[PDB]
A paper describes a structure:
As an E2, Cdc34 is the central player in a cascade of enzymes that includes an E1 ubiquitin activating enzyme, Uba1, and a large family of Skp-Cullin-F-box (SCF) E3 ubiquitin ligases that function in tandem to assemble Lys48-linked Ub chains on proteins to target them for proteasomal degradation. Uba1 is a multidomain enzyme that serves as the gatekeeper of the Ub conjugation cascade by activating Ub in a two-step process involving adenylation and thioester bond formation followed by transfer of Ub to E2s in a process termed E1-E2 thioester transfer or transthiolation. Additionally, Cdc34 contains unique structural features that are crucial for efficient polyUb chain extension through poorly understood mechanisms, including an acidic loop insertion proximal to the active site and a long C-terminal extension. To better understand the molecular bases of Cdc34 activities, we here determine crystal structures of Cdc34 alone and in complex with Uba1, as well as a Cdc34~Ub mimetic that represents the product of E1-E2 thioester transfer.
Globally, the Uba1–Cdc34 complex exhibits a conserved architecture with the IAD and AAD engaging the Ub adenylate, Ub(a), and with Cdc34 sandwiched between the UFD and SCCH of Uba1. Comparison of Uba1Cdc34-bound to Uba1apo reveals a 20° rotation of the UFD proximally (middle) to bring the catalytic cysteines of Uba1 and Cdc34 together for Ub thioester transfer (right). Analysis of the Uba1-Cdc34 structure reveals three networks of contacts at distinct interfaces: Cdc34/UFD, Cdc34/SCCH, and a tripartite interaction between Cdc34, Ub(a), and the Uba1 crossover loop that connects the AAD to the SCCH. At the heart of the Cdc34/UFD interface lies a network of salt bridges between the UFD acidic patch and basic residues of Cdc34. Specifically, Arg14 and Arg17 of Cdc34 helix A (hA) form salt bridges with Asp1014 and Glu1016 on the UFD, as well as a water-mediated hydrogen bond with Asp1008. Introduction of charge reversal mutations at any of these positions on Uba1 or Cdc34 results in a significant loss of thioester transfer activity. On the other side of Cdc34, the helix C/helix D (hC/hD) surface forms an extensive network of contacts with the SCCH around the catalytic cysteines (right). Cdc34 Pro140 inserts into a hydrophobic pocket on Uba1 formed by three phenylalanine residues 605, 695, and 707, mutation of which results in a loss of E1-E2 thioester transfer activity. Interestingly, although Cdc34 contains only the last basic residue in the motif, Arg14, Cdc34 interacts with a larger surface of the acidic patch than both Ubc4 and Ubc15 (middle). This is due to an additional basic residue proximal to Arg14, Arg17, which, facilitated by a distinct hA orientation, leads to extensive contacts between Arg14/Arg17 and the top of the UFD acidic patch that are critical for proper Uba1-Cdc34 thioester transfer in vitro and Cdc34 activity in cells.
Residue numbers in the entry:
A (entry chain A): 11 to 747, 752 to 773, 797 to 1024
B (entry chain C): 3 to 102, 112 to 181
C (entry chain B): -1 to 76
């Protein structure tokens, strides 16, 4: 077919690109084994959209399989795992057929697959045989297995594999100010090229070097952050002016060794550089587990059994002799580490399965597409810090024994008492999108909140949208339009009925407007809070609530293949808001309004014009026709009074009667914005104008614009008129009846277009019509919706941006790129979402244990494209002091009881704290200042806190409020301003 | 070190810029409704007797984000004045208010922003002109420029608060 | 003494720095700012399970020759 459903794969296309998904849609994938690991991999690969998925697992479903196999139910026990899972996988993506391989007796059946994945149900002997067939046949092979809090993956993409894009990052680009004969490229003023040695670039608009711009690639020799060298350019000519370099990614051919070869001489990729010595140890340990099974009728070591763990140490020791390159000379066997592997061999842990499920699934997609850098070739992992303290939760053969429940392979690692405390946890999940759905799935497998003293509260104010289905796997096509949190809660209750009646699905947005719902009692009842948010303001709001209530917060985020986790522990670590992230890129106002040079500048200009044309103008009219004092408000508001009045005047002057009037309006706006205004700009700053130094004014970042001559056959000119007319018709309630060029052309060709001519307030206010003349008249403002392809929103913004791009000789962009920039869409894929959620749930175990050693916690940072995994201990909360009294700058606060009077509050801080309160604020309002005149001081010093707020904010404190946060500036006993904690007023 | 919140840092800078001993006489600063910490009404004054904008009292409004000073504030002349770097809506092109030729940084203060504004007022940036006619008259018709600036200075004197004493010339 | 270390970003780019084991983390951030334009306030450097903090030195984190530091960041989607 070659077509990609952009309404479904929207967010994933921004991660992988179209070419990669075209290859994916030609790839048939086979997954061996459908326990938790296999089904997690299959879920993410089917969501991604490969040509077909085939599963093989004829083993009967057992109750213990449900520990992480979220598609199995108790009614499935006794049936084949592959059969009962096939139809559930098929529901994930109608574009991907899911079939069951009945038997693997004939290995030649693998010839019909492009990627074969062998999970933990395949013996090492069979993995080697299968890998040998795949390697010698050119079939990509990936293996993976998890054992308790341990796991590994192996990748063998064959003797020949080509990486087409190593990182999937946006190509670097930049403007050039000089290219010397030796090839020294200098950047335009204070601009960094951001290149490194060995990158390749192409060039455009380099005047004087001609063939340099023909697409030829040049290898980058970096000189400094502002210059690089490409080799001599004398053969091309002599540099004059202009130029733009663009980084190009070149193909890289690589070669993989077979599994058999890699068992004796592994190439490691580390999941945690702090544990890099463990990779070689776990490499022998996982092999020894297979040798143990051979000697014990296919059985794993018994849970917490010392006799078996000692036998595994002996197997590892014998393996190091047979494979001396693994550990190296002088390196002893880490017996404690191997013992824990034996102890946990039967464990099946949701967070670990999620981690490898997302990682291996992404490796599958790399093997289908050549997109991103494949893991090469072995990666081992452990999360042993998740183990609780053995004194509170002892681990032995009795406490970890199975109790005939779906949690038995989790009890095997953590013990019964610990699993019961997980069930009895009270948790808040904020957001029910990609991370939210995966989080609820993990919690369902955990049984978290299923106990008599536990529960789950999940809230989200958003509805399900088609593009969400690509990575929010609890939702189905039939669910589009329903509330995410309610649908998600029902989906996980079907997966684990122990959660039935234990999940409170709310549809409220978390923020300052819903504090009556999420009040003091709500937050104080929680054990901890987990974020699943997609914006910084909500994360900041939740972080401040957790600081206020001293609740642990589990934070996480993703961006394409990149992800991160952060743990916030009351009285221990800093909070989310304690550190800063790089801000979103901003456009200097002069560049936006007058001198664009990138498509990003014309898209922002177009989006702003869209809002002014079809939203702000409508709202100003509705206020002018319904508010009696609107004309007086804007005159003293004030800002751009001339703009608002002309907006209302124009909106009520050329009022369209039919759609043809809207066509004429849009054609005239085209002439104004892309012809007349451009001529007016050139009239003041001609194309050959000079600056102060005699240099051309239109140089470097300034691109000399040219006016547009309307051409209906230009796609951008046409759709500007189509979308502009349709959106104006919507404002004025004009109905309709694919646009016909001839019909539009006839209307436009009969128009008389005024030619260009180059160029107090009390008259405009008198030219406005009386609101009584327009009784009942109303304009319908547009609400920007980027995901409705029929509303003309993206159509207008794309066409409007591309017309301005044509003015300034900027290369135009398609609707998908414009939607990405104008809609601020975050690239997203299910693989990274599952992996990051797994890491969060490995940190969640440390919360249940109430760990106070900061070194046991780990913040996570991942990029599956590299692949890179890195972890760091959280930063401790900083400590401060006032008058020698130490306090925690994050978590400490003053508690005052009762609606105290301002004078008593000030008097208490002088005696109890030695602090002279000089300024006091509530929210954004200043309530008290010591430098007030004696008139305001006497008035405010006698009022209680609540009345003081009412005096300043003119709004009463609602009855639902039980506490108030006050911020103060104060002087210490030496009369110097000092940082102090905030105040909590307990009403 | 000292990680002050936005409201506290704004209150301390507000107190210093209105103290009868440390307040810069070039700026008359008050809070909106004498309470809102994150939007300030500022009267910009040019005390340089050798500047064309001398004698004016240009009202303006400054709005601060919730992550101050890790994000730049917004500045707008109310109403918009005649200047090559000021648009008709009151906003203006100045590098210090842009983030990412000195740009914005958390070390910048309200004082340094206002100082950079009065400097741009005396010395407009013609290489990054907001909009004509002020930019074209600045180069082509200098006498028209001064007549437009002087007419803008006298128009701003009506916005001087009652009982306010204009500081002496420098 | 003098040594050569690397700084790799979450996107994959690699930076090389000639340093001494006695250099402070504050000085390393100042050099990354001049090389990459990233303000030290926005630099999250991690190495061997620890996040590098101001006031310490490279030798305090057992950073040796050919060691690679990682510039990471937090993401806002999901
Ligand atoms: N303040 C908030 N309170 C409650 N839920 C929130 C808040 N802010 C964001 N969310 C929810 O967090 C979720 C983020 O997940 P995600 O971004 O994957 O879904 P989405 O926004 O529907 O998808 P896309 O970003 O691709 O359109 C959204 O469902 C959103 O509604
Ligand atoms: Mg979102």
């Amino acid at each position: 077919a070659g077509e990609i459903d952009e309404s479904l794969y929207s967010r994933q296309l921004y991660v992988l690109g179209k070419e990669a998904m075209l290859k994916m849609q030609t790839s048939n994938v086979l997954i061996l084994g459908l326990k938790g690991l296999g089904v997690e991999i299959a879920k993410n690969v089917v969501l991604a959209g490969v040509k077909s998925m085939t599963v093989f697992d004829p083993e009967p479903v057992q109750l213990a399989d449900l520990s992480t196999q979220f598609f199995l139910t108790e009614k499935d026990i006794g049936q084949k795992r592959g059969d009962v899972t096939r139809a559930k996988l098929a529901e994930l993506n109608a574009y991907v057929p899911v079939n069951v391989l009945d038997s693997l007796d004939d290995v030649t059946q693998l010839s019909q697959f492009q990627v074969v994945v062998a999970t933990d149900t395949v013996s090492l002997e069979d993995k080697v045989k299968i890998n040998e067939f795949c390697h010698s046949s050119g079939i990509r092979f990936i293996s993976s297995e998890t054992r308790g809090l341990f796991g590994n993956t192996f990748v063998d993409l064959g003797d020949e594999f080509t990486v087409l894009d190593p990182t999937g990052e946006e190509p670097r680009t930049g403007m050039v100010s000089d290219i010397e004969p030796d090839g020294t490229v200098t950047m335009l003023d204070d601009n960094r090229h951001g290149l490194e040695d060995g990158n390749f670039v192409r060039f455009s608009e380099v005047e004087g070097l001609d063939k340099l711009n023909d697409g030829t690639l040049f290898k980058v020799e970096v000189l400094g952050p502002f210059a690089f060298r490409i080799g001599s350019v004398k053969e091309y000519g002599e540099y004059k002016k202009g130029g733009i370099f663009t980084e190009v990614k070149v193909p890289r051919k690589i070669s993989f060794k077979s599994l058999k070869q890699q068992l004796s001489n592994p190439e490691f990729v580390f999941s945690d550089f702090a544990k890099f010595d463990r990779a070689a140890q776990l490499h022998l340990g996982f092999q020894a587990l297979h040798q143990f099974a051979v000697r014990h009728n296919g059985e794993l070591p018994r849970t917490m059994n010392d006799e078996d763990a000692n036998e595994l140490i002996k197997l590892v020791t014998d393996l190091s002799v047979q494979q001396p390159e693994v550990l190296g000379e002088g390196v002893d066997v880490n017996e404690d580490l191997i013992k824990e592997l034996s102890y946990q061999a039967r464990g099946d842990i949701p967070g670990v399965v999620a981690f490898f499920g997302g990682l291996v699934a992404q490796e599958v997609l790399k093997a289908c597409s050549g997109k991103f850098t494949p893991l090469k070739q072995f990666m081992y992992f452990d999360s042993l810090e998740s183990l609780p303290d053995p004194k509170n939760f002892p681990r032995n053969e009795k406490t970890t024994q199975p109790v005939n429940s779906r949690y038995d392979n989790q009890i095997a690692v953590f013990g019964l008492d610990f699993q019961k405390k997980i069930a009895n946890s009270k948790v808040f999940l904020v957001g029910s999108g990609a991370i939210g759905c995966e989080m609820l799935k993990n919690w369902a497998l955990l049984g978290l909140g299923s106990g008599s003293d536990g529960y789950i509260v999940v809230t989200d104010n958003d509805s399900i949208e088609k593009s969400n289905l690509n990575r929010q796997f609890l939702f189905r096509p039939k669910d589009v339009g329903k509330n995410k949190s309610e649908v998600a809660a029902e989906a996980v209750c079907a997966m684990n009925p122990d959660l039935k009646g234990k999940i409170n699905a709310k549809i409220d947005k978390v923020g300052p407007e819903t504090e009556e719902i999420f009040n003091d009692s709500f937050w104080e009842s929680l054990d901890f809070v987990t974020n699943a948010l997609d914006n910084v303001d909500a994360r900041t709001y939740v972080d401040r609530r957790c600081v206020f209530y001293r609740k642990p917060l589990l934070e996480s985020g993703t961006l394409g293949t990149k992800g991160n986790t952060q743990v916030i522990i009351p009285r221990l670590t800093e909070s989310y808001s304690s550190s800063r992230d790089p801000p979103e890129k901003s456009i200097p106002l002069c560049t936006l309004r007058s001198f664009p040079n990138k498509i990003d500048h014309t898209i922002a200009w177009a989006k702003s014009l869209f809002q002014g044309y079809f939203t702000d103008s409508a709202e100003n009219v509705n206020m002018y026709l319904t508010q009696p004092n609107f004309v007086e408000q804007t005159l003293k508001q004030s800002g751009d009074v001339k703009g608002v009045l002309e907006s209302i005047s124009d909106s009520l002057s050329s009022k369209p009667h039919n759609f043809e009037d809207c066509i004429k309006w849009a054609r005239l706006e085209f002439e104004k914005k892309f012809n007349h205004d451009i001529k007016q700009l050139l009239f003041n700053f001609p194309k050959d104008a000079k600056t102060s130094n005699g240099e051309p004014f239109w140089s470097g970042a300034k691109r000399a614009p040219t006016p547009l001559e309307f051409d209906i056959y230009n796609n951008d000119h046409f759709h500007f008129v189509v979308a502009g007319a349709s959106l104006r018709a919507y404002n004025y309630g004009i109905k309709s009846d694919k646009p016909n060029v001839d019909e539009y052309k006839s209307v436009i060709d009969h128009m008389i277009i005024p030619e260009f001519t180059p160029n107090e307030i009390d008259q405009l206010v008198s030219s406005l019509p009386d609101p009584s003349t327009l009784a009942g008249f109303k304009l319908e403002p547009v609400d920007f919706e980027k995901d409705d392809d029929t509303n003309h929103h993206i159509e207008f913004i794309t066409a409007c941006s591309n017309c301005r791009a044509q003015n300034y000789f900027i290369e135009t962009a398609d609707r998908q790129k414009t939607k990405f920039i104008a809609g601020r869409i975050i690239p997203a894929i299910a693989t990274t979402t599952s992996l990051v959620t797994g890491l969060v749930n490995l940190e969640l175990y440390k919360l249940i244990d109430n760990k106070t050693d900061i070194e046991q916690y780990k913040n996570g940072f991942v990029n599956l494209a590299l692949p890179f995994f890195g972890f760091s201990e959280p930063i401790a909360s900083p400590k401060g002091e006032y008058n020698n009294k130490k306090y925690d700058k994050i978590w400490d606060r003053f508690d005052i009881k009762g609606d105290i009077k301002l004078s008593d509050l000030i008097e208490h801080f002088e005696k109890d704290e030695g602090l002279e309160i000089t300024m006091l604020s509530y929210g954004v309002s200043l309530l008290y200042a010591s430098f007030f005149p004696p008139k305001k001081l006497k008035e405010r010093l006698n009022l209680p806190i609540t009345q003081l707020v009412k005096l300043v904010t003119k709004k009463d404190i609602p009855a639902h409020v039980s506490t108030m946060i006050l911020e103060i500036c104060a002087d210490d006993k030496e009369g110097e301003d000092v940082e102090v904690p905030f105040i909590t007023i307990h009403l | 070190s000292r990680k002050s919140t936005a409201s506290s840092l704004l209150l301390r800078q507000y107190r210093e810029l209105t103290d009868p001993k440390k307040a810069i006489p070039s700026f008359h600063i008050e809070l909106e409704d004498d309470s809102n910490i994150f939007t300030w009404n500022i009267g910009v004054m040019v005390l340089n007797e050798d500047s064309i904008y001398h004698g004016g009292f240009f009202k303006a409004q400054m709005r601060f984000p919730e992550d101050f000073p890790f994000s730049p504030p917004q500045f707008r002349f109310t109403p918009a004045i005649y200047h090559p770097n000021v648009y008709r809506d009151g906003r203006l092109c100045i590098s210090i208010l842009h983030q990412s030729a000195e740009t914005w940084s958390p070390v910048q203060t309200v004082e340094s922003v206002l100082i950079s504004i009065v400097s741009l007022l005396e010395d407009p940036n013609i290489n990054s002109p907001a909009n004509v006619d002020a930019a074209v008259d600045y180069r082509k018709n200098p006498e028209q420029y001064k007549q437009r600036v002087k007419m803008e200075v006298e128009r701003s004197k009506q916005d001087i608060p009652k009982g306010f004493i204009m500081p002496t010339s420098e | 003494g003098a040594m050569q270390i690397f700084v790799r970003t979450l996107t994959g780019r690699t930076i090389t720095l000639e340093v001494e084991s006695s250099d402070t983390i504050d000085n390393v951030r100042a050099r990354i700012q001049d090389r990459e334009g990233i303000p030290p306030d926005q630099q999250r450097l991690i190495f061997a399970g620890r996040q590098l903090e101001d006031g310490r030195t490279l030798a305090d984190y057992n950073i040796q020759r050919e060691s690679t530091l990682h510039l990471v960041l937090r993401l806002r989607g999901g």
